[PDB]
Amino acid sequence: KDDDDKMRAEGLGGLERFCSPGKGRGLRALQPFQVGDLLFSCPAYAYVLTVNERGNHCEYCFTRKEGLSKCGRCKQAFYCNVECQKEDWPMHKLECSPMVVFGENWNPSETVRLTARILAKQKIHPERTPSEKLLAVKEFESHLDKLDNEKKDLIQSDIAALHHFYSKHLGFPDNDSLVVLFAQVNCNGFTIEDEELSHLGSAIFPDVALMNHSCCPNVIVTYKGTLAEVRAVQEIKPGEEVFTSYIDLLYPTEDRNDRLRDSYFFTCECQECTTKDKDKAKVEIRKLSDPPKAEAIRDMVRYARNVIEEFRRAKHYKSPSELLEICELSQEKMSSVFEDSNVYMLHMMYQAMGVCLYMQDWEGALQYGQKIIKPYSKHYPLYSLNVASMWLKLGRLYMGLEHKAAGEKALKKAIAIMEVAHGKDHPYISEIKQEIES
Numbered sequence: 001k002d003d004d005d006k007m008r009a010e011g012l013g014g015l016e017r018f019c020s021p022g023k024g025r026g027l028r029a030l031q032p033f034q035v036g037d038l039l040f041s042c043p044a045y046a047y048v049l050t051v052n053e054r055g056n057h058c059e060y061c062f063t064r065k066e067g068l069s070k071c072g073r074c075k076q077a078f079y080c081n082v083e084c085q086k087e088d089w090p091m092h093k094l095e096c097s098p099m100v101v102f103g104e105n106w107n108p109s110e111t112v113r114l115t116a117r118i119l120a121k122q123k124i125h126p127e128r129t130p131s132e133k134l135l136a137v138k139e140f141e142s143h144l145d146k147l148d149n150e151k152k153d154l155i156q157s158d159i160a161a162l163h164h165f166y167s168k169h170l171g172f173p174d175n176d177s178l179v180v181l182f183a184q185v186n187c188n189g190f191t192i193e194d195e196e197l198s199h200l201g202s203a204i205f206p207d208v209a210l211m212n213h214s215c216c217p218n219v220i221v222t223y224k225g226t227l228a229e230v231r232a233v234q235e236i237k238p239g240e241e242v243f244t245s246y247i248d249l250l251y252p253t254e255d256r257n258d259r260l261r262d263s264y265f266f267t268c269e270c271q272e273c274t275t276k277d278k279d280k281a282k283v284e285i286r287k288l289s290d291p292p293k294a295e296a297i298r299d300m301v302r303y304a305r306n307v308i309e310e311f312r313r314a315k316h317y318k319s320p321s322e323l324l325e326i327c328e329l330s331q332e333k334m335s336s337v338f339e340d341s342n343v344y345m346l347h348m349m350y351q352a353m354g355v356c357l358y359m360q361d362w363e364g365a366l367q368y369g370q371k372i373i374k375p376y377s378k379h380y381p382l383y384s385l386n387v388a389s390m391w392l393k394l395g396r397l398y399m400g401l402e403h404k405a406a407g408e409k410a411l412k413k414a415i416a417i418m419e420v421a422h423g424k425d426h427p428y429i430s431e432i433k434q435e436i437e438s
């Protein structure tokens with residue numbers, strides 16, 4: 001049977017497009033799907049490898065490897081072999097000669113980069129692609145009438161950078177069209193991360209962007225090279241709408257919704273946002289002899305929201321040693337009122353694990369991830385990729401310090417989850433099983 005189901009997935013069989021009352025257009029099933037089933041795949045309509053990963057990944061197929069070959073002309077684009085080089089040429093052409101001309105003045109933002117490739121795919125290929133079997137880039141929603149003279153000013157920067165760096169092999173539409181398009185990208189664009197959650201690049205998957213949002217989703221989006229796959233994490237029955245999450249589901253219901261309104265212009269009405277069952281445990285209060293009063297909680301919460309924004313902006317400025325102090329002390333304050341499973345505590349613990357890893361303090365980074373994992377399993381849903389990568393980190397750290405048994409446990413915990421989300425076939429599942437076997 002295995003042959004037929006790959007074909008069905010590739011063609012989006014057993015699914016359809018419809019109008020979701022109160023959510024524009026959307027996607028629903030016309031057959032049952034069990035937990036771990038592949039629904040559909042969607043090859044990338046446009047993509048770009050992030051600048052800081054050149055030399056580690058091939059630009060065309062995203063394979064991670066050593067001994068890639070360098071572009072003879074510009075020396076700033078790498079490939080598996082000559083086949084991958086030829087296939088990337090229609091796109092790489094947009095930057096090759098310019099990178100040589102501008103030297104080190106060449107710094108277009110990743111948003112500009114990806115939009116240039118969209119424009120170039122439209123001259124070459126005006127008609128409907130295999131990425132667009134149910135929704136087309138042309139049809140993408142913009143939220144143009146909801147924007148303001150902060151946002152609209154930000155786009156006009158990108159429009160200028162596009163004209164400045166790309167005029168040579170693109171001809172541009174009128175300003176009105178470019179503003180709409182840059183808004184469409186924001187509403188429909190995807191990021192790609194690796195198994196440790198480092199940024200790799202950006203891309204457009206049109207069929208994938210038909211699906212609407214829920215904080216208790218029933219599918220999950222994973223990557224295989226530049227290809228997107230979609231697998232179920234709850235049982236789905238005929239006539240039922242198919243939902244992803246668009247955001248990190250760790251945080252409480254207020255925090256989630258500020259983000260959704262800001263980036264996507266809507267308010268979620270799902271069961272977790274209605275009942276708010278998990279909010280109380282995400283903001284778990286210390287149980288002291290004289291237990292903390294109500295105003296003393298509103299204090300530590302607003303302090304915590306701000307020490308996250310301070311740290312966000314401090315990543316571009318400061319020393320590693322100074323950032324690790326900012327985490328230590330911010331935890332040290334919060335621990336009087338908040339328990340160790342409070343998500344605002346867990347936030348700073350994660351950032352501190354990041355700082356310890358760049359410093360190669362592997363024992364120091366290990367007891368952060370030890371305190372993280374059990375709370376992460378409680379707050380997140382079943383089959384969460386966030387939970388899976390943290391196990392993965394623990395597995396690797398344990399084995400770096402020669403403690404085989406606890407490392408093998410943590411690696412199998414990660415594989416258990418990945419089987420459901422990435423499928424049993426996945427290249428990652430092999431790569432981890434070779435860490436086991438040595």
Ligand SMILES: O=C(NC1CN(Cc2cnn(Cc3ccc(Cl)cc3)c2)C1)c1cn(C2CC2)nn1
Nearest residue numbers: 188189190191193194195221222246385388389
């Ligand atoms: O950009 C979006 N999502 C990106 C967040 N990325 C999460 C992700 C996936 N795989 N991995 C890598 C990964 C691989 C192996 C493990 Cl064990 C762990 C991790 C990260 C996907 C997005 C865009 N929208 C548009 C529709 C509004 N919604 N979400």
Ligand SMILES: O=C(NC1CN(Cc2cnn(Cc3ccc(Cl)cc3)c2)C1)c1cn(C2CC2)nn1
Nearest residue numbers: 110111114185186189190191202203246247248
């Ligand atoms: O929900 C969170 N992140 C989600 C937003 N991320 C995906 C994303 C990004 N951009 N775009 C739109 C976009 C993508 C590519 C280009 Cl070229 C253009 C546009 C999607 C994932 C989140 C992050 N945190 C941090 C505090 C820990 N908390 N929640």
Ligand SMILES: C[S@@+](CC[C@H](N)C(=O)[O-])C[C@H]1O[C@@H](n2cnc3c(N)ncnc32)[C@H](O)[C@@H]1O
Nearest residue numbers: 023024025141187188209210211212213264266
């Ligand atoms: C990537 S799109 C999804 C496709 C969209 N329905 C369309 O066809 O234009 C994101 C947009 O869909 C809408 N949307 C997604 N999930 C929603 C929800 N749970 N409630 C209301 N609107 C939602 C929002 O308007 C959001 O900006």
Ligand SMILES: [Zn+2]
Nearest residue numbers: 058061080084
């Ligand atoms: Zn390649």
Ligand SMILES: [Zn+2]
Nearest residue numbers: 071073074096
């Ligand atoms: Zn080149």
Ligand SMILES: [Zn+2]
Nearest residue numbers: 215268270273
């Ligand atoms: Zn919700």
